[PDB]
Amino acid sequence: EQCGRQAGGKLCPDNLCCSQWGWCGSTDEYCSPDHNCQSNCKD
User: Fold this and answer.
1) Which residues, in sequence order, are bridge partners of residue 39?
2) All domains of the chain in start order, with CATH
């Protein structure tokens, strides 16, 4: 994992959203509170 709880709080590089699964990205699956985004989230 790159980020979030799974990685002990690591933040993603390049302002990327940390998904509920602990991976970094920029689409709704990573960024939406409806998908339990962990950091650098939208809304």
Assistant:
1) 18
2) 1-43 (3.30.60.10)
Burial of 8 (0-12, 13-18, 19+ CB in 10 A): exposed
Q: Give the technique used to solve this structure.
A: X-ray
Token pair recorded at residue 23: 């991976």
- Residues listed for the chain: 43
This structure's resolution (angstroms)?
A: 1.7
CA neighbor of 6 nearest in space, from 41, 36, 26, 34:
36
> Would you tell me how many other CB atoms lie within 10 Å of the CB of residue 18?
27
Closest CA to 39 of 27, 19, 29, 28: 19
